[PDB]
A paper describes a structure:
Epsin and the phospholipid PIP2 are essential for clathrin-mediated endocytosis, and we show how assemblies are formed between the ENTH domain of epsin and the ANTH domain of Sla2 in fungi.
We tested complex formation between the S. cerevisiae ENTH2 domain and the ANTH domain of Sla2 to verify the assembly relevant to the ENTH2/PIP2 crystal structure. Indeed, an assembly with a stoichiometry of 8:8:24 ± 3 for ENTH2/ANTHSla2/PIP2 is formed, similar to the ENTH1 complex and ENTH/ANTHSla2 complex of C. thermophilum.
Numbering used by the authors: 16 to 147
The structure:
């Protein structure tokens, strides 16, 4: 029974837990309600715009977005198309920790893939056709 604010905040929290499928699928289901959608995308917008030490907000928000564009509301797709700039800037996201370790690498990878997916509307439609 968790609120949508708490669910989306926990899913994208700054910690090393990756969002659970349980959580991604509940988000996806909730994305079909216009009020929940507002809440989910509000938080994801904030977190995708984070930088530097808060890279985990980005990485996780990207995972959520990647799941929503396949399993959530068609509005999740339209949102990414409307805010495509945010996603595209993430293909070059950098954060080197003070040990000289690139944490951005996986974000780049995912952002490159999601931009690719978004631009290949026929492939995206095929995937979306398999959702329940």
């Amino acid at each position: 029974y968790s609120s949508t604010q708490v669910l989306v905040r926990d899913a994208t929290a700054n910690d090393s837990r990756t969002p659970s499928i349980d959580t991604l699928d509940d988000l996806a289901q909730r994305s079909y309600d216009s009020v929940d959608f507002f809440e989910i995308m509000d938080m994801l917008d904030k977190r995708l715009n984070d930088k530097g030490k808060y890279w985990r907000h980005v990485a996780k928000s990207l995972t959520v977005l990647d799941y929503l564009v396949r399993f959530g509301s068609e509005n999740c797709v339209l949102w990414c198309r409307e805010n495509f700039y945010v996603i595209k800037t993430l293909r070059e996201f950098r954060h080197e920790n003070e040990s000289g370790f690139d944490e951005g690498q996986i974000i780049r990878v995912k952002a490159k893939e999601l931009v690719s997916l978004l631009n290949d509307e026929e492939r995206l439609r095929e995937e979306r056709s398999m959702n329940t």
